[PDB]
C-alpha cells in the first residue's frame, strides 16, 4: 500500500550542487517505481541544519525524508555550536546513495597546472589567496583545511550557501581554488571554466583517470571523500524503510544506475540501513580527528 500519496525529499542545498543532482535522479527513479511523485523540497540554510531540524520534527509516516550529507550526519558538529536536532537520535537510516570524490580545482587565471605548482604558488603568497567553501563544515571545507595543514599553505576561506554559487565565483576568480564535490564541479571542467588539479580520494576516479590523486601529486596519505544518504524521521515504519532501501539499492547496483551515477562523478553506495549507520559512525570519528589536526572547531 505505501505510498498512496506524494512523498517529499528535503534537500539541504539549492539546485546545481551534488545533493540536489543525486536527489533528482533518486526522485525520478522512485516516482517511476512506486507510481507517486517523489518531489524535492530545496530547503537551504546553515549547512543543512535548517532542513535537518525540519525533518526531525515531521510526522514519521514515510511521506517525508531527508537527503542527508556529511555535514548533517557527521561534520556540522565540528563547526556549529548548537544545531536544532541530534542526527544520532532524530533520524533512522535508509541507505547511502553515493560515495563521491572531491576535486581540487583552480580558477583559469591562476597560473598553476598541478598540485605542486599550487603549493609553491601559495607558499610565495601567504594569506593573499582565497578559497571557496560550498558550505561551512562540508567535506570540501574540511578537506581544504586539512590540505592547508599538510602542506603549510595559508589561504582564506569564503563560505557560500551551496556548491552552485561558490562555483560561479570560482569561475570568475572571486576565489582562487576549491576542494568540492566532483559532480557539481564536472560541468565547469568540461566547459573549460575552471582547471582541475587532483581528486581527494586514495585512488583516481576511473572516468578521469589521468587526473592524479592529491596523495600521489605531492601530499602523502591525504584522502577525503563525500557521500549522501536517505534518512527518515525516527519512528518511520520498518516496512517503509525496507521497501525504500530495496528500491534504491536495486537502482544503485543495476548496470544502468551505476552508469548514470558514474557519468555525473559519483560512485553508487548501497547496502543496508545499518551499513549507513556504520559509515556515519566511522565518519564522525575520523573527521573529528581531521578537524582537531586542521585547527577547526565551533566559535
Ligand atoms: O549540494 C551542495 O551544494 C553542497 C553539498 C556539500 C556536501 C559535502 O559536505 O561535501
From TrEMBL:
Keywords: Signal. It comes from the Bacteria. The keyword Signal applies. The keyword Chloroplast does not apply. Coiled coil: none annotated. CDD domains: PBP2_Bug27. SUPFAM superfamilies: Periplasmic binding protein-like II (SSF53850). Belongs to the UPF0065 (bug) family. PANTHER family: BLR1237 PROTEIN, TRICARBOXYLATE-BINDING PROTEIN. This is Tripartite tricarboxylate transporter substrate binding protein. It comes from Rhodopseudomonas palustris (strain ATCC BAA-98 / CGA009).
Amino acid at each position: 500500500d505505501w505510498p498512496t500519496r506524494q512523498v517529499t525529499l528535503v534537500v539541504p542545498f539549492t539546485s546545481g550542487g551534488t545533493t540536489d543532482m543525486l536527489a533528482r535522479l533518486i526522485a525520478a527513479r522512485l516516482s517511476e517505481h512506486y507510481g507517486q511523485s517523489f518531489v524535492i523540497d530545496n530547503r537551504s540554510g546553515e549547512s543543512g541544519n535548517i532542513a535537518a531540524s525540519y525533518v526531525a520534527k515531521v510526522p514519521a509516516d514515510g511521506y517525508t525524508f531527508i537527503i542527508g550529507t556529511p555535514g548533517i550526519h557527521a561534520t556540522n558538529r565540528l563547526v556549529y555550536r548548537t544545531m536544532g536536532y541530534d542526527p544520532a537520535t532524530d533520524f533512522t537510516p535508509v541507505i547511502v546513495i553515493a560515495r563521491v570524490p572531491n576535486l581540487l580545482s583552480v580558477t583559469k587565471s591562476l597560473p598553476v597546472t598541478s598540485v605542486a605548482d599550487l603549493i609553491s604558488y601559495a607558499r610565495q603568497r601567504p594569506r593573499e589567496l582565497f578559497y571557496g567553501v560550498s558550505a561551512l563544515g562540508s567535506t570540501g571545507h574540511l578537506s581544504t583545511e586539512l590540505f592547508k595543514t599538510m602542506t603549510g599553505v595559508e589561504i582564506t576561506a569564503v563560505p557560500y550557501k551551496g556548491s552552485a554559487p561558490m562555483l560561479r565565483d570560482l569561475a570568475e576568480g572571486r576565489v582562487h581554488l576549491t576542494i568540492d564535490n566532483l559532480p557539481a564541479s564536472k560541468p565547469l571542467l568540461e566547459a573549460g571554466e575552471i582547471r582541475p588539479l587532483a581528486v581527494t580520494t586514495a585512488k583516481r576516479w576511473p572516468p578521469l583517470s589521468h587526473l592524479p590523486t592529491i596523495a600521489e601529486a605531492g601530499v602523502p596519505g591525504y584522502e577525503t571523500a563525500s557521500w549522501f544518504t536517505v534518512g527518515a524521521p525516527r519512528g518511520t515504519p520498518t516496512e517503509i524503510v525496507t521497501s525504500l532501501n530495496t528500491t534504491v539499492a536495486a537502482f544503485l547496483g543495476s548496470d544502468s544506475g551505476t552508469v548514470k551515477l558514474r557519468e555525473i562523478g559519483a560512485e553508487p553506495g548501497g547496502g543496508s540501513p545499518q551499513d549507513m549507520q556504520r559509515h556515519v559512525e566511522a565518519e564522525i570519528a575520523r573527521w573529528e580527528k581531521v578537524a582537531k589536526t586542521a585547527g577547526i572547531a565551533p566559535l
